[PDB]
Amino acid sequence: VDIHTTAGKLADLKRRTEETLHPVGEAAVDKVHAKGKLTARERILALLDEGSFVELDALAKHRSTNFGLEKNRPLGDGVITGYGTIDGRDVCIFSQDATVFGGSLGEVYGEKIVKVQELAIKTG
Amino acid sequence: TAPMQGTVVKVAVEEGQEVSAGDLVVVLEAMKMENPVTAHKDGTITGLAVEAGAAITQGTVIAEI
Amino acid sequence: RPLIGINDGAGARIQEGVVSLGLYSRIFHNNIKASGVIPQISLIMGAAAGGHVYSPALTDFVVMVDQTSQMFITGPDVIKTVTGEDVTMEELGGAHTHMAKSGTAHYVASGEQDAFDYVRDLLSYLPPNNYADPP
Amino acid sequence: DHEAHIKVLRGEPTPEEMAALMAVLASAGERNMWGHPVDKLRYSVFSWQRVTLLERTHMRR
Amino acid sequence: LYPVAIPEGSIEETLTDEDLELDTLIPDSPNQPYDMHEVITRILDDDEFLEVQAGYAGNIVVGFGRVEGRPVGIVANQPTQFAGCLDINASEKAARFIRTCDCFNIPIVLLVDVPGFLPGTDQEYNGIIRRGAKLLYAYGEATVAKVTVITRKSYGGAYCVMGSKDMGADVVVAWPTAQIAVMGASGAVGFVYRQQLKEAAKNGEDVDALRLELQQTYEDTLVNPYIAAERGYVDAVIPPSHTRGYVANALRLLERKIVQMPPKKHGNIPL
Amino acid sequence: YAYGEATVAKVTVITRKSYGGAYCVMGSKDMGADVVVAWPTAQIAVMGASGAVGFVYRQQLKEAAKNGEDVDALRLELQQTYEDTLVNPYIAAERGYVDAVIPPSHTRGYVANALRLLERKIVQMPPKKHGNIPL
Amino acid sequence: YAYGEATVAKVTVITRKSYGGAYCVMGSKDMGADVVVAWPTAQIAVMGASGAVGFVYRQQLKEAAKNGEDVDALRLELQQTYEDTLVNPYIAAERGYVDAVIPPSHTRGYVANALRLLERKIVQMPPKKHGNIPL
């Protein structure tokens, strides 16, 4: 679809969103299932009430250029962040993702955790 | 009246063209926007003072209603 | 403690993108928080274009230099593009224009030294914060 | 029995009409003081409302 | 508050027929306006919008409604007048409406489609700096729940004024058509590619074709929400149909909110 | 709004004219002017005499008009009467809106005395997040 | 927890090393250090260069081991380059975590002056009963 059109921009959004589900390729998710572990997204969707999860800063990407890190900018920087409900009461949540750079904390990764912390404190 | 200086890209009302309140009267490309100018009041719109391709100036009478 | 901003800048640094607008928003939000908390004084010493106008507007006092300081949102080139109006920066946003027409300046100094003197005179009357008695 | 009952002021239904009536009528029929506005108000250090509004809100149950 | 039953299920699950009408509202051509009431009446409960100063400054629309029975103060740019630019009158209108809502704890939703401030020497002499700073101050001062939806454009200082994140917007969501930038590409090309490339076109190049090429490149690269989403100035990029869900959910989350301010007797609002 | 809400010491010296709603704006007592003093030249009235007379004596002027009398001479005589009777500080002083009618030389002493005593006014307004100012 | 809850004036002088999490347990700017100054000999880094190299250049050590090169000479050269480039205060000063890099002799002056500036300090924290320190 022509990217210069509302329809094309909408489809592009949906494409990016899909990419956020497996930001370093499905092979890593497959290896984690072969390891028998839940990925950070499955963990959030397991802990929270089903469909309650609202995700913040999905499309984030790190800003580093040291040592060629600019060559690989995984969507989400390796943390999944947002809020939702447990037993119908709202909670703020984050889930760090081992398959992205080990899970090591970066700039954006920290900014996202900070955002969720601030929102949780503000909203009580 | 043309609310700003702009290219009249389309004129929308005819001669007597009885115009209802809130009808679009001109399309005026200004500020990179196809800004409509609309009739403030419902009545005859006989006269017109706009042509396509004209760089109509702010405050130029478009039509008398 | 009182805050003095001395302002001189062609607006946002276009190459850095939205970042500059986020940092502008943060500077504004700090000026709003400080509003009525501490004396804020803005010295305008040159072209304060674009977003650089709103910080002074949010500060408590504006000291401008008679002809070497100018302050405007939209450039004359843009004004011409949209309206055709021909004006200089000095007619648009010079210190005389902001003192006499729009009432945005609080002083128009004959020079930088006179501006500094004016700011020291203001600070001589203002307390350091709203929980302090005037000197 | 001091309960307030329904009362058919006028007419008598048959038992079937009463059953319809009652079925239709039946089918038709934690503190969290976080960010309470009283905390958001700005008070004078000596304002009596610190007693009569603020405490009378936070303490009240 | 009025009682209203929220449907069970996700925002995606509970999309109505009417929500989907937002997905096609925004014209493909960036020069074509649209009526922001189309967004307002579909976001609000029951289409009940009570506009305030309907006639004063049509480039911004402000008024009350409800979202799941909770009253809301909407403020929204209106492309059908002055391309939705901010001006003195609109700034004072929205500033005092915001401060009225904030006095009475009514949460605020901004619908943003602002290309910037209305250019003019009359605006300058009448004090667009001093009197436009009122809307910026009132937004920053407001301590209610503040939610921003960005529908098509948010440029320059007007991105700051129309409730940027660092102005303390709690939840900011953008539609895919959003355009967050320091200025339009038509201008930005005349800086980021002026100094070497477009002046070096005096080598003998077709300078207008080069400018158009570089405008298209800049628009594709940077005039989109994603550069702001990669910095958290936009918390989510959402399908328009999601907007009613997102706004209601955010208002339920924010309904109890504490923000800390320095002690003062009162603020010194620009006036 | 700014004058009514201001809780610092507010001192008003009425030097000459103070008419109508501008008397309300320029520090009326009921706005909370802590000390209001008036010079003997002070002229505190709802309306300038020439305007006042037309309302106060409207019927008498209409009678003189239908009697064909010198309406202008009657206006002048009624105006001098109104001016000498009411266009003065003492009516306000009587109502106690002016705390003292003072020789001008006293002004600096009255101001200094008030400002020394009012350093910490124990006054307040109802609790509010902030005020909604006409903007 | 103690340094984060500490609302008093908190000043940090960095002399030599500040590595890893211990850079956070000793008081960094984001832990609310009011003034942070570094001596030229400061060394602010995620870890010492000998450890860093094994991560940052692991791919180059790998290819050198496949080529059978003098991997210990490569180790030393890379470690040297790392320490020269990164293990210094200036990177932190650029990122704004160190407010000034000062000659050591200035330290007494800077501590005294910063403490004087911070004599009065307000910090806003959420309302709580008490903190639940980790034990």
XYZ file of C-alpha atoms in Angstrom, chain E residues 10-214:
205
model
C -9.485 -5.535 24.834
C -9.520 -2.246 22.945
C -9.232 -4.306 19.747
C -12.123 -6.539 20.814
C -14.511 -3.731 21.792
C -14.127 -1.532 18.685
C -17.546 -0.348 17.527
C -18.658 0.266 13.956
C -18.257 3.986 14.696
C -14.661 3.790 15.960
C -13.601 2.288 12.613
C -14.789 5.500 10.908
C -11.709 7.216 12.402
C -9.347 4.913 10.472
C -10.407 6.647 7.221
C -11.119 10.185 8.484
C -7.707 11.746 7.802
C -7.363 12.698 4.108
C -4.413 11.290 2.194
C -3.427 14.726 0.887
C -1.749 16.725 3.700
C -3.359 19.924 2.359
C -6.948 18.713 2.797
C -8.491 19.750 6.151
C -10.973 17.766 8.202
C -13.511 18.715 10.871
C -12.193 17.803 14.330
C -15.752 17.429 15.655
C -15.689 14.131 13.753
C -13.065 12.981 16.260
C -14.621 14.689 19.288
C -18.159 13.308 18.878
C -16.815 9.778 18.300
C -14.509 9.917 21.321
C -17.115 11.354 23.693
C -19.984 9.412 25.209
C -23.336 9.840 23.444
C -21.909 12.523 21.103
C -22.731 15.000 23.914
C -20.227 17.809 23.323
C -20.963 21.140 25.060
C -18.725 23.615 23.221
C -17.515 26.712 25.108
C -16.990 29.949 23.141
C -18.177 28.190 19.987
C -17.795 31.468 18.073
C -14.714 33.152 19.539
C -11.689 31.474 17.903
C -12.671 28.648 15.583
C -9.098 27.426 15.092
C -9.380 25.758 18.514
C -12.449 23.922 19.833
C -12.866 23.587 23.602
C -15.732 22.168 25.607
C -17.110 19.565 27.962
C -18.156 15.988 27.402
C -18.091 12.623 29.136
C -15.902 9.548 28.698
C -17.430 6.604 30.562
C -19.523 8.998 32.633
C -16.483 10.915 33.860
C -16.653 14.553 32.708
C -13.808 15.583 30.409
C -12.607 18.912 29.087
C -11.683 18.514 25.434
C -9.383 20.991 23.705
C -8.709 20.342 20.035
C -7.137 22.072 17.058
C -9.549 22.708 14.172
C -7.953 22.542 10.691
C -10.989 24.156 9.024
C -10.000 27.615 10.333
C -6.552 29.191 9.902
C -5.265 25.675 9.122
C -5.598 25.032 12.856
C -2.797 27.457 13.714
C -2.444 28.784 17.229
C -3.131 32.501 17.584
C -3.617 34.952 20.451
C -7.381 34.469 20.708
C -7.248 30.661 20.587
C -4.398 30.619 23.110
C -6.337 32.733 25.615
C -9.479 30.656 24.985
C -7.746 27.350 25.689
C -5.615 28.730 28.525
C -8.579 29.940 30.548
C -10.661 26.857 29.695
C -7.820 24.600 30.891
C -7.429 26.590 34.108
C -11.197 26.442 34.706
C -11.125 22.658 34.308
C -8.067 22.384 36.570
C -9.698 24.413 39.347
C -12.549 21.867 39.366
C -10.472 18.702 38.768
C -11.962 17.939 35.318
C -9.424 15.891 33.299
C -8.278 17.291 29.955
C -7.947 15.623 26.547
C -5.995 17.445 23.823
C -6.600 16.546 20.169
C -3.596 17.954 18.321
C -3.302 18.948 14.650
C -1.300 22.183 14.874
C 1.146 23.267 12.128
C 2.441 26.078 14.346
C 1.652 29.677 15.204
C -0.270 31.952 12.827
C 2.359 34.169 11.131
C 1.842 37.910 11.193
C 3.158 41.303 12.211
C -0.213 42.106 13.772
C 0.057 38.965 15.914
C 3.579 40.047 16.873
C 2.555 43.594 17.800
C -0.480 42.280 19.699
C 1.784 40.025 21.747
C 1.608 36.438 20.494
C 4.684 35.712 22.633
C 3.233 37.034 25.903
C -0.382 36.000 25.314
C 0.433 32.673 23.663
C 2.587 31.834 26.682
C -0.686 31.686 28.652
C -1.763 28.366 27.093
C 1.697 26.888 27.705
C 1.637 28.019 31.343
C -1.921 26.813 31.986
C -1.160 23.384 30.504
C 2.021 23.029 32.549
C 0.270 24.199 35.714
C -2.707 21.868 35.304
C -2.415 18.891 37.670
C -5.489 16.929 36.531
C -5.174 13.910 34.257
C -3.971 15.208 30.879
C -4.121 12.959 27.796
C -2.877 13.919 24.316
C -3.932 12.383 20.985
C -1.871 13.577 17.991
C -3.893 13.259 14.756
C -1.794 14.653 11.899
C 0.589 17.458 12.781
C 2.553 18.826 15.766
C 5.403 21.119 14.709
C 7.882 23.353 16.492
C 6.941 25.327 19.570
C 3.320 24.372 18.999
C 4.247 20.770 19.768
C 5.316 22.105 23.166
C 2.188 24.218 23.636
C -0.206 21.425 22.618
C 0.769 19.271 25.596
C 4.100 17.630 24.905
C 5.278 14.867 27.243
C 7.711 17.112 29.124
C 4.849 19.548 29.668
C 3.599 16.674 31.851
C 1.232 14.976 29.436
C 0.450 11.691 31.181
C -0.489 9.526 28.175
C 0.430 10.677 24.663
C -0.779 8.580 21.728
C -0.271 9.302 18.030
C -2.217 8.194 14.987
C -0.107 6.776 12.135
C -0.734 10.012 10.197
C 0.914 12.071 12.959
C 3.734 14.392 11.870
C 6.047 15.476 14.705
C 8.909 17.666 13.515
C 10.844 20.847 14.217
C 9.303 22.322 11.060
C 7.926 21.253 7.712
C 10.327 19.533 5.348
C 9.989 22.501 2.972
C 11.799 24.557 5.600
C 14.070 21.905 7.080
C 15.592 21.173 3.654
C 16.616 24.845 3.598
C 18.808 24.226 6.633
C 19.957 20.606 6.822
C 20.786 20.594 3.083
C 21.162 24.324 2.360
C 24.640 25.012 3.624
C 26.547 22.568 1.430
C 24.178 20.892 -0.982
C 21.583 23.385 -2.207
C 24.075 26.255 -2.455
C 26.587 23.936 -4.162
C 23.804 23.382 -6.689
C 25.273 26.585 -8.160
C 27.649 24.075 -9.726
C 24.855 24.110 -12.334
C 22.304 21.594 -11.061
C 18.505 21.654 -11.359
C 18.108 23.119 -7.898
C 14.309 22.875 -7.703
C 14.346 19.175 -8.615
C 17.063 18.651 -6.013
C 14.985 20.463 -3.377
C 11.906 18.355 -4.179
C 13.987 15.162 -3.973
C 15.445 16.192 -0.607
